[PDB]
Each structure stands twice: as structure tokens, then as C-alpha cells.
């Protein structure tokens, strides 16, 4: 919980350039959760669901999705 207050420390006089801050942190948060708080036996159920979000959690807002896809194709095999 200390870390969130630390991010909150950034907004003081009321700061606009900070959507980047919530954004990056929820995103990272997702990378950490997803990466580490789960088990990989093939049986999964609701665990896979929460996960799936961690899967959409890195990725892109899609500007890069347009750019990535154009790419993964020229790279993987096309």
C-alpha cells in the first residue's frame, strides 16, 4: 500500500500529466499479478479468466496493435 501513496505523491498541486501514472502502474500491476500469482497445471477454470486479463494487460492500447500485427507477420513467417 505504501507504493500507491508514493505514486499519489506525484499529484500535489493537482497535476494533469498523470494519466500516464495510473496507466503504467495498473498495467505493471497486471504484469506482476499475472506473471506470478498463478499455477500452471493444465487444469485451470476461473484462474484462466483472471489470467486472460493479465494477457490483455500488457499488449497494447492498439496503436501498437496495429503496428505489431503488421510486424509479427513479416517476422514469424508471413
Amino acid at each position: 500500500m505504501c507504493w500507491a501513496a508514493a505514486i499519489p505523491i506525484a499529484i500535489s498541486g493537482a497535476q494533469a500529466i498523470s494519466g500516464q501514472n495510473a496507466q503504467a502502474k495498473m498495467i505493471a500491476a497486471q504484469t506482476a499479478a499475472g506473471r506470478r500469482q498463478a499455477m500452471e497445471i493444465m487444469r485451470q477454470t476461473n484462474i484462466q479468466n483472471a489470467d486472460l486479463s493479465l494477457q490483455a494487460r500488457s499488449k497494447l492500447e492498439e496503436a501498437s496493435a496495429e503496428l505489431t500485427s503488421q510486424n509479427m507477420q513479416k517476422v514469424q513467417a508471413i
Binding site: 497445471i41 493444465m42 487444469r43 485451470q44 477454470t45 484462466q48
Partner: protein
Amino acid sequence: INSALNQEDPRTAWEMLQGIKAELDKVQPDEQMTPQREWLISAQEQVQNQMNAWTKAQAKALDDSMKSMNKLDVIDKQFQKRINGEWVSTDFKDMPVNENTGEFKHSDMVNYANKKLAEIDSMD
């Protein structure tokens, strides 16, 4: 296995069941007639039947979507007639099936009012 069966959409049912099989493979490594394997493969026929039902249901949803869109625009046009003109009798009995619109359930006019009111809300 019962949870794998009772999923909402039979897709996730089938893939979860397939994963459970691929895992059972580890602990029970002899494909055979282990009582658990019998249970598991009635499960496969079960999810096949559930996928049959899901295909049929999605197809019915397709048919309803087209029927609703067509009869909805017909209702809206015959209703604009009443708004501008007069004496149009929008009660239940409307401009009937051209070839392909539908029997005009009572559901459309309620759906028509709701969708059109939200549509007006979304106008510019």
C-alpha cells in the same frame, strides 16, 4: 468434470475438458478404460451434444437478429407515417411479411420503443 460440463458457453467447456484430459494423462498414463476415463469421455460426448445445442441456438439468434432488424425498420417507417400523417393503426397489426420479415411478435413494439428512445438519446 461436472464443472467442465456446466460451463456457460460450451466452447470453454470443451477446452477445459480437453485440458483436464491432457492433465489426467500425466497421472493416469495408460490410455485404457480407467473408471475415471469412462467418466471423462461420456463428458466428451456430453460437450459434443452441448455444442450441437449451442450451434442451433446461435443460428436461431442470427435469424432473430435479421427478423428483428427488418420488422423494426418496417415498424419505424409505418410509425413515422402516423407521426406525420394520420389514421395509421399502429396497434399490433402492421405491414405484414413482405417475404422475409416475420410474424411481428408483440415483442417488437416494446423493443421498438425502447431502442428508438435510446437512439434519440444518442443523437447529436
